[PDB]
Design a protein around this ligand. Sequence first.
Ligand code: GDP
Ligand code: UDP
Ligand code: MG
Ligand code: MN
Lengths: 180, 542
Amino acid sequence: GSKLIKCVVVGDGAVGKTCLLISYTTNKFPSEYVPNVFDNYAVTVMIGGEPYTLGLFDTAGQEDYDRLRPLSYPQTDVFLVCFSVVSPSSFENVKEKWVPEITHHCPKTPFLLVGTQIDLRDDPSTIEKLAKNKQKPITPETAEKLARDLKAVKYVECSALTQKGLKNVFDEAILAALEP
Amino acid sequence: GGMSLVNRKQLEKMANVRFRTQEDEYVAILDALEEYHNMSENTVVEKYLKLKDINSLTDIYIDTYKKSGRNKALKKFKEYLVTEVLELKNNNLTPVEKNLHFVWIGGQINDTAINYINQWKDVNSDYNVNVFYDSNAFLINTLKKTVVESAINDTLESFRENLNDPRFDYNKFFRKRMEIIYDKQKNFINYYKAQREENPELIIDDIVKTYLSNEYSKEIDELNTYIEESLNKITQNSGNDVRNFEEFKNGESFNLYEQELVERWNLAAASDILRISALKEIGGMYLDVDMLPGIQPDLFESIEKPSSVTVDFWEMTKLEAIMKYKEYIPEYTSEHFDMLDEEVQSSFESVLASKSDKSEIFSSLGDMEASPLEVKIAFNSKGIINQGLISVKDSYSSNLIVKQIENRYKILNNSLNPAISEDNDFNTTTNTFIDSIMAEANADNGRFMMELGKYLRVGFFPDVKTTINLSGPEAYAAAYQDLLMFKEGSMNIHLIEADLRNFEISKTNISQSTEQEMASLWSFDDARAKAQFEEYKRNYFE
Ligand SMILES: Nc1nc2c(ncn2[C@@H]2O[C@H](COP(=O)(O)OP(=O)(O)O)[C@@H](O)[C@H]2O)c(=O)[nH]1
Ligand SMILES: O=c1ccn([C@@H]2O[C@H](COP(=O)(O)OP(=O)(O)O)[C@@H](O)[C@H]2O)c(=O)[nH]1
Ligand SMILES: [Mg+2]
Ligand SMILES: [Mn+2]
């Protein structure tokens, strides 16, 4: 592709950002280990008989990197604002941290609101340790509302483990980057 | 695969315009392209350098004449140039010097590293084995171990005063530990610099053990015995001292080598800088001490791979099986093998029983060929990683990688050195450092700069991989881009997988799914950080 689409994956630590891009670009969840490789997440896609290079960039979600992270934001065409549906603190940090941050540095850039680790919704162990507080997993209807409220283009769910909604997340990412 | 490069005749036809003056800049291009074709008695390096001249000539025509009608034809000519580089790279080959290079610096080489290296010796009898050590620096790992342990307990003293978890998670633990490691590490650097202003002939280990004796009451007799035992062990295992590697020592990246060795205690980074200069000057194949030889193609391709196991699971299981029944490496894990059904396990027991020699288990390297322009690299999960390198002695790319690493260190030290000069605590020094990074940050280097700002955290904080972007695989991709774009000092990597696949090595030359590769010696993830927290808590309570 002679045309390059910069998509930057953003969101809290331990929401499944890294595993997302590995699962999508290699068709293999990195359950074993992540090798210390140069990432270079770049998929060629044909769209209306025109080749496109989709450029994916991982980010460090932690507060410690709040001033370094935006150095990667320039020239960005679409954001995946990511949160784990079994981590409501990651969901509550979408409104409070991530959507403000991208509208500050890239105000005109569209962003998908992306649910991750949906397989752990129907997981025995992780429900009851979550149920040990008020905490309950995030429903797709709750997150579709926050998407509308925060002027997101769409809400999309996926599991990097089962690759369920995985291909759709990135399909809709190019569609956001071409729509007006 | 491609298409022969255009002649001198074929380019005028292409770049033809009407009412044209045949410019001096345009003739320069034809002149250079003619010479390139009647260059059939020259080596590929001289040829490559012609193409660089052609491209640089093409670029000044377009910069001077921004409205000319040839520009659109010359740009398509440029794309033919980059294609010819791959034609150069693939046809005219050179045999690779039969040297296997390993690197273990900072401390005593363990038996796992030797056992792994021996698997390369036993099936590559024609290969000269070189295991690089640094005779002056056997105590860096001991120093780091002492300072980090000291910092774990000092961090836990501030945890005993407090309760279970008001807000005292593993995240606060590694943050506080990082501040205490940086005070201790800065103290050692300050001591190291003072001692070499007093008398700069003092070797590194001499300064480390006085510092260890003075700050941690370490018995210097036990450290001289560790040194003597480490020198004894490596000199019976193909050891090559860095200090007697004069071309490296006199080189411009040696100050960078000692930066990581002495100041940062990052031996992965120090090993990154040394490995490429050893190819540039000696040539051969570099290997990480966690890489094993490739398994023989038609072996275990009789046992059907179950549907319920990953490919990567299968690749680990292979080596486990080999070692379980042929015991070439003791203490090798069996945990993936022990998770299969008894029938498929006995399938492995049958096929391995049928083999006598290790030639019938591990492929040999044999006579290997490669291009004087390229450094070949290993691939892992669709990404390059310098854990396997093949390069011809004094290859063009080998010099391009060194300058790439040198350039990145120039940017880093530019921003870091002013901040560390002010002797402040970790948090202040970080903030000063980042202030400088943001000032020199643009959209082209932003992502690289994003990673530099974590440089102080490398090897002491979870999920910090700056070494990859500084001295590691990123610099190899930026070099490959430099080769293909007739450039020096590429930063913004525009290359994709298929571009970089030009420089891969056969997956039959290295087994990469080893036991020791799963445990990184310089990096750790969030999950392994959470574990360490409860491990340290109990190790302090006992
Ligand atoms: N069950 C499940 N676990 C996941 C999925 N994606 C990632 N993980 C795991 O959850 C953790 C998230 O880590 P990572 O992918 O590095 O997320 P990051 O820290 O936000 O980049 C890791 O331990 C992963 O193994 C998923 O789709 N399903
Ligand atoms: O204490 C050390 C740790 C690492 N290394 C070198 O750094 C390489 C990196 O090893 P590792 O597999 O830990 O790196 P990763 O694959 O995790 O990037 C090793 O093979 C050694 O050459 C070393 O010399 N001393
Ligand atoms: Mg991550
Ligand atoms: Mn490794």
